[model samples]
Target chain A: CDAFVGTWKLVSSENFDDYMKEVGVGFATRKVAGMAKPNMIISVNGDLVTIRSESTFKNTEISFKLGVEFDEITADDRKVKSIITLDGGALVQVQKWDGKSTTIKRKRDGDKLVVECVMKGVTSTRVYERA
Target chain B: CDAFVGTWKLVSSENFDDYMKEVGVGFATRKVAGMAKPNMIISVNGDLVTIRSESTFKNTEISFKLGVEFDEITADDRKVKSIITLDGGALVQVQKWDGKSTTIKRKRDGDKLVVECVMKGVTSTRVYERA
Candidate 1:
């Protein structure tokens, strides 16, 4: 784990609710998720960087190598193709499912990580702190 | 929106990092989730309360009456039956997925909502102030 390798906890999020709704998440599911602030771990090896978003309800993980396209799964269960890269301290990830695409840009800030997700017609930001 | 009907901003969290790992989240999602402090619009009508937990990357919201059981989807895509209730000044929510269950309690502390989540043998606390 280098800059992206650590146990980061969900401290805050912005407009993610609409993103989930936009992604077709149900009301019941979103309610339970409202209170569950999950955590995650990142590991790097060679040119590969893997991210695991963990929680009691469920875990969502996406793994890829730097600037390399690979198959990944979305939270909505869409198996998409994605590529990730690092720009300075920022990590930019792009996902393409079918003809649609979503991009997530993450940056490390001190002991915290800030992520911005863009999908469909919505964009959201989430913040995590290193534990 | 009533007492619990407002956008709450996250200010601090205690041990939530370990809790997410105990539950099982990944590095990428957790890292992105780290910087997002989502908000909610809680609408209380009669005895029915709806809480919309909103963020930029992902937004989770749950709705039910004061005391009710319903089917909810987990972040990891688990369809679990759950229930929610209010005790004194605390809003207690319980979820049962398969044979596993989790409990969350949201209490009002002056201008803030203090939420506690417990799953398996792990417990975590999160604090949110009204915005």
Candidate 2:
């Protein structure tokens, strides 16, 4: 698990359209975000994890304790309270906020880290590499 | 000051392009963000302030206390330390982070709250209305 401890840069992301759609992102904004190549950096230390997503278009960050409840404020600054717990080899996050509901789950698959986001009727997956 | 206590939403943001550039945010992300209409919600209780920003593209939140030192992690999880103090009616924040030094000063200008950010060699201003 030490291999997952350092800062991991987001080499790439996929399924932007589906992910944004579930977050109630409009069609026009989704169209623009779909063309973006966002980078993410993940910092893991013990039970605390911090994730930062960066792009030429926007930047966002989140911090939480493993298996503990935390609050997330969106890039637009909407507050979402969340709790993350380990399930088998994956970390599952349940997010509660106004509007709809959402979940973000992360796991280690082979040599990559896979993140799955589910909200509304959309489910999206993104993969990252160790940098 | 209780009039400033409730949640104040972010109606519009100006000078994001310049702000991002100073923070080393890439050009591509700035282009996409410039066209975004991000909404911010602010909650103030005495000297503690919580600010949240929401939009279709992204969401972000921040919390700090007046005249208190705090830590801010960049969207990429880079850590930055800051201290804020009241300079007259304006709240002034000095940030110590990687690379350049930055300062954000906010004050009430009539019915609008004005924020002036100075970083690198450039200065940018943004205004928010009470919602």
Candidate 3:
């Protein structure tokens, strides 16, 4: 609950290949991406959550309300729309725009928060530690 | 060249339902959208163009250049990415993420600029006059 209400730094991202594949990231971009380390920051205020993901290559942010249906323009692609909500202690997102149907699930596991993105027969996961 | 430079106002849009379908707007949102008038404004300078879509329900703005690649985050939904370019006198935008490929093309037709967005199997067109 409140344990998840702080900024967490991206210590490392595992299975990025599968994550990129789920989001349809190009081969060339993925190759370059695999060599980089991304930083993810999360801030929680009541039912509002603001997540910011930053890297030397790119940066993105998302703000949404828990339990309420909200729209998200993905940072990887601007033309798609996704809906996000909180389920129990986990964050769940469903991609609803144009091309593909995907789901991203996030939850706190001990001292880290685990995120899983699934789409197009692929799944990617990443873990973050408190900043 | 510069003939495409000006503030153009949206007059009408065709294929919008299809375009919305491609972008993954839900049935409820689309039904309400189909009954409304969406206005588009375009301002061009040199090779740079700024496009704004404004309605009572939402507002979105995009700025990009010709030939050069640019990133876009869709309005309404905030979680995808798209690339934009100008081909000949037509403005072309391509969604680079998600499961579908979406394209938006714009051209001048007499006193109006016609913009068409194609995604999935649906295409949405908007016409604009000088504002």
Per residue, candidate 3 scores C-alpha lDDT tens digits across B10-106 of: 6786778777876778898888677656666667666677878777767788887766566676764645565666566566777666665778787
- Best by the TM-score measure: 1
Off by over 4 Å in 2: A1-3, A9-14, A45-47, B1-131
True contacts kept of 2: 0.00
Candidate with better TM-score, 1 vs 3: 1
Query: Each prediction's TM-score against the native?
Result: 0.47, 0.44, 0.45
> What interface-residue Cα RMSD does candidate 1 give after superposition?
14.0
Which candidate ranks first by lDDT, i.e. highest?
1
B11-51 per-residue lDDT for model 2 (tens digits): 55767787878778777777766766665566776667876
Question: Across residues A1-131, which tens digit of lDDT does each residue of candidate 2 receive?
Answer: 23234345455576768688668777776775666556666677776787787776568888888777888877545588888877765778888887557888877654467788888767887787655
Residue lDDT tens for model 1, A1-131: 25467778899988987777766678877766656788878887786787998776678887677888888766557788888887765888887866877778988653458898888779888899767
Kept native contacts, as fractions per model, are 0.00, 0.00, 0.00
Q: All models: lDDT?
A: 0.75, 0.69, 0.70
Task: Rank all candidate structures by their lDDT, best first, as comma-separated numbers.
Answer: 1, 3, 2
DockQ-based class of model 2:
incorrect
Q: How is the predicted docking of candidate 3 categorized under the CAPRI scheme?
A: incorrect
lDDT of 2 at A31: 73
